Design a protein around this ligand. Structure first.
Ligand SMILES: COc1cc(CNC(=O)CCCC/C=C/C(C)C)ccc1O
Ligand SMILES: [Ca+2]
Ligand SMILES: [Ca+2]
Ligand SMILES: [Ca+2]
Ligand SMILES: [Ca+2]
Length: 148
């Protein structure tokens, strides 16, 4: 009956130590690839794999913690985006009473570009999602992103 639970939040908290679990403190593609299990199959990493090494190839396909927070901070917007996404609810979600499915989401992602994989969302939304029915909405948008 309860959709929001503390357990769900703990997942993100635990994942924090999961990345460094490999060693004392290090962020590498191997660590990220591990998360693939919780997501079953998230190409998002496959395509990015090259992107990570490219920008990370400055010294090694690994990123230090001091830079990890900065990178995630800029890449991921704080929870304050909730208000910003609020305006996007009407435009992003025309139906309003309805939610965007994975199939419809793909069409939107296509218009954006093709830098990332096309399957990332199709499979990521399939496993990582408890419902498995794939659905995106304003309420979920806030939980989707959380830099802090
Ligand atoms: C540094 O590159 C990395 C960035 C992230 C951050 N992860 C994300 O941004 C997940 C992608 C969000 C998918 C959005 C789908 C919408 C259209 C519904 C994780 C690991 C990394 O290696
Ligand atoms: Ca490490
Ligand atoms: Ca680095
Ligand atoms: Ca929709
Ligand atoms: Ca869902």
């Amino acid at each position: 009956a309860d959709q929001l639970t503390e357990e769900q939040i703990a997942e993100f908290k635990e994942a924090f130590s999961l990345f460094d679990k490999d060693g004392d403190g290090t962020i590498t593609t191997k660590e990220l690839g591990t998360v693939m299990r919780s997501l079953g199959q998230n190409p998002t990493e496959a395509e990015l794999q090259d992107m990570i090494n490219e920008v990370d190839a400055d010294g090694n396909g690994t990123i230090d913690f001091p830079e990890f927070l900065t990178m995630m901070a800029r890449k991921m917007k704080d929870t304050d985006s909730e208000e910003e996404i609020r305006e996007a609810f009407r435009v992003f979600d025309k139906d309003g009473n309805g939610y965007i499915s994975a199939a419809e989401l793909r069409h939107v992602m296509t218009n954006l570009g093709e830098k990332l994989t096309d399957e990332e969302v199709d499979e990521m939304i399939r496993e990582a999602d408890i419902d498995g029915d794939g659905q995106v909405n304003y309420e979920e948008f806030v939980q989707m992103m959380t830099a802090k």
